[PDB]
Design a binder for this molecule. Structure first.
Ligand SMILES: [Mg+2]
Lengths: 59, 79, 42, 258, 245, 158, 107, 190, 51, 51
RNA sequence: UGGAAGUCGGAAUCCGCUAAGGACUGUGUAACAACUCACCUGCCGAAUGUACUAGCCCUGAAAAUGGAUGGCGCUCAAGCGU
């Protein structure tokens, strides 16, 4: 599946329709559906970002 | 380009004997090769070529066509 | 004075005529008659 | 991108179902008078056939929806005709027999609920129960390594067979969508599959110019049917199970018997 | 001649008309001749003539032709031998310049009263004498150029500033506004588009049209009409004075 | 004491048509909710259809009317099933409309038509219906227009 | 600056005062410039220019022909194979290449 | 093809005196005199009519025939210069640094000199010396305008082009930096 | 090109974040308190990117 | 004053909808355009909801 | 479509008035507006337009000591065809 995800996305929606002078993309692709999910996802993302910063600082 | 104020090395129009002989030999070989290809040519050729005809700017084309009709009717009557 | 606008802004330029170096060799009536003969022969 | 409903006696259009952004590639008509469409705009829609209005719109597929199948297709195709070979006398009791067969095929937990499977070019399938689950899929069927061309429920409603472009036919439990076994042996993409009436056997016609009959309870290749000299495009099994028809690029109908 | 202008091929829908349009005009005029009692000739000289659509709509029972002058003259017939009806070749002497034909069944008095009472103020074309002096005031340039007061006027669009400079106004862009000199109306005088009694040129008329100032009037002048019943041409006041060929 | 005429496009049966109007009628002194309610009341006949609405402004109250357009009249005459515009998108007007109500739409649009006769008005309405994408009498409105032009189908005069 | 700042400056201040006429004059000189390039470039640059201009003429002629002809699958496949990328698809047991150039042992 | 005879005509106004000798054209009017040597073009001059100057080429190629149009326009421009004159109006615009323009007339040479300072804040002083016969005036009707007037269209337009080309923005984005001096109007003095 | 024209927002500094519907005065407030050249216009969605 | 083109009820509804994003932050509702309509001119029920 | 009015897109692309005008050729607007092109009329005035063919000329690739139609030089030739 991840062998073909990239070409599958490009076949579903090309580069020119996504960004550029002739782009038709209006809705983004989100991993959240509700405001509560967005808040939880944001706080988990901040925690993961801080953890990775600490790992790179230790390394 | 700065050709006038600073010209480059000239290109010699003076030939050499070796180059002349090689060019003549290769021209004769190409002539023989195209003769062979003309002999072995698979392309279709018409038995009679398409004649261009009478030019339009010729002033007496219409009277010439009148004549041509006259000899074709005369030949049809004679035959 | 002139009433029109010239595109390049050189308003002093005169009203130029067409560059026809072969002008005046043949007449209009003779050319019409030659047109008729040409169409018939074609 | 439209599905038109025609009155056969008059030849006139009653309803036009539009709303798809791509070509509608597959249409089914259920026994609860609902029209299911799958399209190349990656969507599967459920329409009310009486009113001509949209009921459900599923947009879970990631590529072209190639085929859809209902859990009651086998009985809806044959109506009141069955193994008895005798038809009822009048139209009312014939319709009653047809409705009884549809309900017996479509009962879930004692309630009539048609189940809809959709196969797509995103290598996957989705299983839907619009009556009980709404827009939430029952399961996502995963495991094909290439595009899934054809999909079909068994006549007893317990199994689902899928044919893929990864040279494979796969078997799935029709209730929870879990993978069961892989029918391996084709060497070119499998185009069509068809069930037997007793749900023991599935026949698959592929691009490798062959038909293969698979025993699904044992999981093995029961029979191999060569003879086509080119690609096989259409395969059907008779409702009484006597004959199998195949047709394809070799221009000749081939009929197969025991 | 290797050195020549590259002729532009237009990738547009509408093509050139040719002889088919001329024959169609001939056939339409010759088929509208027998259906009407009077044929008026009218003139609209040095006028925009976009109100002839409204004239056609208001005179829905009449037929109006506004094609080529020579083509309409040849459709009617310039000599008694080739004329379509008796006495039509007398009517062709008015067909010079910008003319039109009006086939009608009404009495001529209604037509004359209608075209005497029809008045429409119009944008002046080049060659017209300016009736008054028009001056854009110094400061911020507005849409009408000072015809309506600025408290009711709207600032002119910023996309017209290169066109105003090309037409000769020394305007500039100040913080998104088109201004004549300074924003406070200083360091410059007003811009006189035209003076009273001055023959307008095309640049001045273009400036007037951009500023939506109308200095002329759309008038349809009837020269003369041919009646089929008497087979004769009656001349009118405008056709009495207009030159004929 | 002046009259201000404002033209807009609205969908019948909604209030949010005044969302774009409220920037400009605010300085004019109009109430956005009042003019939205007036627009909805005037366009309740044209539910689900994009229609043209004229507002006349005098003494800081608005009078709201609906200007008939050929496309809106044809889509209304198609008698499509009701739908929710947020969930039913990319629809097509592929139903059929009869030539008699096409003539009725032409009679309604005579006040805008510059054509000399009702035959020309009917042909304009047929071209508009062809652009919409519907059928006339089960056939293509271009085909009925060609039949009317060639004389197979007659149109009543006025 | 941020976002479309050059467009905002373009809207607030315009162009240079000679930009339109200057671009018009350059586009007018473009024909003489093309002829000078055709007659004056040398070497590989000239060869690439001539090849590019030949291609431009070919596509221009194709576009003109299509605009002239504005006012005027192959093999049967099933519906599930429609709209996909399908191949075009076009005793003496002789091989396609019966004879090739022989190779000596020294080569 | 060689054309046997080709002819051009130049009308001359009543207040103009034209003297042509050995293809040296001297045109005199109310505003002064202009002089142009046209001996690089093979042309026969004549007086075909009172107030009309005739130009002939005999047995000339197409290029030689076409050169007569250039000669006609040059002489007509000389006539327009000595009757009505030529006038070029230039506007200098700036964003932040005001452009300081000083116009002087040099005593020993008789030509005008234009000094430009503070162009985009530069400390250099640009100096352009006008062609003789060209008068430069800082306008009083409008803001930030120069007026270059004269009898020679060549001299007036060349002086305007020199003023335009000395103030070039260098190594900066020309979409953003709009500073410069540009020709705004071209016409006749009268 | 879009990344080159993107504004620089430090996510760990002192920041006022102005939000709401269109046409309520957000860009007017930002113009009045800062030096940013965000346009102020009477139509909705005048501002289409973060300033 | 509702000259933005949206109802104040919808403004309160949007604020309540995006309130879960506003945790661990400070929130200030700024009522703009007091030159058009004051808060006291608003009816008591809407003022009560805002409070 | 947040907005999209011929001119961000997808598909259709008809009728009227016509003298003629695309459900639009480009510039432009957030969207409009505005300008422009296709096409038509008025002025003017007599020959033109397009594509190919044949000649001669330019380009159609060049390194490295300073140099070669044999050299000077030659331009209605002292070059090219008869
Ligand atoms: Mg705003």
């Amino acid at each position: 599946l991840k062998k073909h995800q990239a070409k599958m996305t490009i076949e579903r929606e090309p580069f020119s329709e996504t960004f550029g002078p002739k782009a038709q993309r209006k809705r983004p692709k989100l991993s959240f559906n509700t405001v509560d999910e967005l808040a939880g996802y944001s706080e988990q993302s901040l925690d993961s970002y801080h953890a990775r910063l600490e790992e790179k600082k230790l390394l | 380009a700065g050709t006038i104020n600073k010209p480059k090395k000239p290109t010699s129009k003076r030939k050499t004997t070796r180059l002349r002989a090689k060019i003549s030999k290769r021209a004769a070989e190409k002539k023989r090769k195209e003769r062979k290809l003309a002999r072995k040519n698979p392309e279709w050729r018409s038995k009679l070529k398409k004649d261009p005809g009478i030019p339009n700017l010729f002033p007496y084309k219409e009277r010439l066509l009148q004549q041509i009709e006259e000899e074709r009717i005369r030949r049809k009557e004679e035959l | 004075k002139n009433l029109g606008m010239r595109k390049n802004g050189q308003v002093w330029l005169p009203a130029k005529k067409a560059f026809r170096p072969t002008k005046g060799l043949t007449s209009w009536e003779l050319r019409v008659k030659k047109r008729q003969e040409q169409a018939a022969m074609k | 991108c439209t599905v038109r409903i025609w009155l056969v006696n008059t030849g006139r259009t009653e309803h036009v179902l539009s709303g798809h952004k791509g070509s509608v590639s597959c249409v089914k008509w259920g026994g609860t008078d609902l029209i299911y469409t799958g399209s190349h705009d990656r969507s599967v829609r459920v329409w009310d056939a009486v009113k001509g209005t949209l009921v459900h719109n599923f947009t879970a597929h990631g590529h072209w929806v190639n085929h859809i199948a209902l859990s009651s297709d086998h009985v809806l195709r044959t109506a009141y005709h069955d193994h008895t070979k005798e038809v009822p006398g009048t139209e009312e009791e014939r319709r009653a027999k047809a409705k009884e067969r549809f309900e017996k095929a479509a009962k879930i937990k004692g309630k009539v609920a048609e189940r809809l499977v959709s196969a797509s070019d995103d290598f996957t399938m989705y299983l839907w129960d619009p009556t009980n689950n709404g827009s939430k899929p029952v399961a996502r069927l995963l495991g094909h390594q290439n595009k899934v061309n054809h999909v079909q429920f068994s006549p007893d409603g317990t199994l689902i067979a899928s044919a893929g472009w990864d040279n494979s036919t796969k078997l799935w439990n029709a209730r929870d969508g879990k993978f069961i076994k892989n029918l391996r042996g084709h060497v070119a993409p499998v185009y069509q599959c068809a069930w037997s009436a007793d749900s023991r056997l599935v026949v698959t016609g592929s691009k490798d110019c062959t038909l293969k009959v698979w025993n699904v309870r044992t999981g093995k290749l029961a029979m191999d049917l060569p003879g086509h000299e080119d690609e096989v495009y259409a395969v059907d099994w008779a409702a009484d199970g006597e004959l199998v028809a195949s047709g394809g690029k070799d221009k000749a109908v081939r009929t197969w018997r025991n | 001649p290797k050195s020549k202008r590259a002729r532009v091929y237009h990738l547009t829908q509408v093509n050139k008309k040719g002889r088919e349009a001329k024959e169609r005009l001939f056939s339409n005029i010759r088929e509208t001749i027998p259906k009407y009692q009077h044929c008026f000739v009218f003139s609209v000289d040095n006028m925009r003539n976009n109100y002839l659509k409204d004239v056609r709509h208001e005179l829905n029972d009449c037929r109006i032709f506004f094609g080529k002058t020579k083509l309409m003259a040849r459709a009617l017939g310039t000599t008694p031998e080739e004329e379509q009806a008796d006495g039509l070749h007398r009517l062709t002497r008015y067909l010079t310049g910008t003319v039109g034909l009006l086939f009608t069944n009404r009495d001529p008095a209604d037509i004359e009263s209608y075209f005497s009472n029809l008045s429409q103020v119009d944008f002046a074309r080049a060659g017209t004498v300016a009736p008054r002096t028009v001056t854009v005031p110094p400061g911020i340039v507005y849409s009408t150029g000072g015809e309506v007061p600025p408290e009711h006027d709207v600032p002119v669009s910023h996309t017209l500033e290169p066109e105003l400079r090309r037409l000769g106004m020394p305007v500039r862009m100040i913080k998104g506004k088109v201004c004549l000199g300074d924003e406070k109306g200083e360091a410059s005088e007003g811009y006189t588009i035209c003076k009273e009694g001055e023959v307008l040129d095309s640049r001045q008329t273009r400036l007037l049209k951009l500023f939506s100032i109308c200095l002329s009037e759309f008038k349809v002048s009837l020269l003369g009409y041919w009646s089929s019943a008497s087979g004769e041409v009656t001349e009118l006041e405008a056709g009495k004075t207009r030159p004929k060929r | 004491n002046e009259i201000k005429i404002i033209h807009l496009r609205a969908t019948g049966g909604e209030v949010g048509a005044s969302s774009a109007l409220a920037p400009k009628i605010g300085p004019l002194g109009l109430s956005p909710k009042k003019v939205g309610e007036d627009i909805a009341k005037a366009t309740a006949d044209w539910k689900g259809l994009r229609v043209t609405v004229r507002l006349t402004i005098q003494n800081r109250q608005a009078q709201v009317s609906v200007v008939p357009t050929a496309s809106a009249l044809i889509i209304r005459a198609l008698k499509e099933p009701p739908r929710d515009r947020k969930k039913e998108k990319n629809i097509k007007h592929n139903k059929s409309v009869s030539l008699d109500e096409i003539i009725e739409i032409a009679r309604t649009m005579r006040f805008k038509s510059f054509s000399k006769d009702l035959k020309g008005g009917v042909k304009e309405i047929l071209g508009t219906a062809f652009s919409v994408g519907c059928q006339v009498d089960g056939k293509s409105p271009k085909a009925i227009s060609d039949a009317i032009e060639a004389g197979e189908i007659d149109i009543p005069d006025e | 600056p941020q976002n479309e700042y050059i467009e905002r400056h373009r809207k607030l201040h315009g162009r240079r005062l000679d930009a339109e006429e200057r671009a018009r004059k350059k586009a007018a000189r473009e024909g003489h410039k093309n002829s000078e390039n055709a007659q004056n470039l040398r070497g590989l640059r000239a060869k690439l220019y001539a090849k590019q201009r030949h291609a431009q003429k070919i596509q221009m002629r194709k576009a003109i022909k299509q605009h002239e002809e504005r006012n005027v699958p192959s093999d049967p496949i099933p519906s599930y194979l429609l709209d996909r990328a399908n191949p075009t698809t076009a005793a003496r047991f002789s091989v396609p290449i019966p004879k090739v150039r022989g190779i000596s042992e020294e080569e | 093809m060689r054309y046997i005879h080709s002819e051009e005509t130049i009308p001359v106004p009543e207040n103009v005196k034209v003297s042509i000798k050995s293809r040296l054209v001297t045109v005199e009017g109310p505003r002064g005199k202009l002089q142009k040597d046209l001996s690089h073009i093979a042309v026969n001059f004549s007086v075909v009519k009172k107030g009309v100057i005739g130009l002939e080429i005999h047995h000339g190629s197409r290029k030689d025939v076409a050169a007569l149009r250039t000669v006609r326009t040059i002489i007509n421009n000389m006539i327009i210069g000595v009757t009505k004159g030529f006038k070029y109006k230039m506007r200098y615009v700036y964003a932040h640094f005001p452009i300081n323009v000083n116009v002087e007339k040099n005593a020993e040479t008789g030509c005008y000199e234009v000094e430009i300072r503070n162009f985009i804040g530069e400390k250099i002083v640009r100096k352009v010396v006008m062609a003789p016969g060209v008068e430069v005036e800082i306008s009083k009707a409008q803001k930030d305008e120069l007026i270059l007037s004269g009898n020679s269209l060549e001299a007036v337009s060349q002086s305007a082009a020199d003023i335009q080309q000395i103030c070039k923005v260098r190594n900066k984005d020309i979409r953003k930096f709009l500073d410069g001096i540009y020709v705004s109007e071209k016409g006749n003095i009268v | 090109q879009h990344l080159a024209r993107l504004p620089d927002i430090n996510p760990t500094t002192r920041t006022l974040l102005v939000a709401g519907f269109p046409n309520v005065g957000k860009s007017s407030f930002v113009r009045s308190v800062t030096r940013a050249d965000t346009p102020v216009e009477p139509y909705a969605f005048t501002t289409k990117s973060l300033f | 004053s509702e000259q933005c083109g949206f109802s104040l009820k919808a403004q309160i509804n949007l604020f309540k909808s995006i309130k879960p994003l506003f945790a661990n932050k400070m929130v200030f509702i700024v009522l703009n355009k007091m030159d058009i309509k004051k808060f006291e001119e608003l009816d008591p029920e809407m003022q009560q909801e805002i409070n």
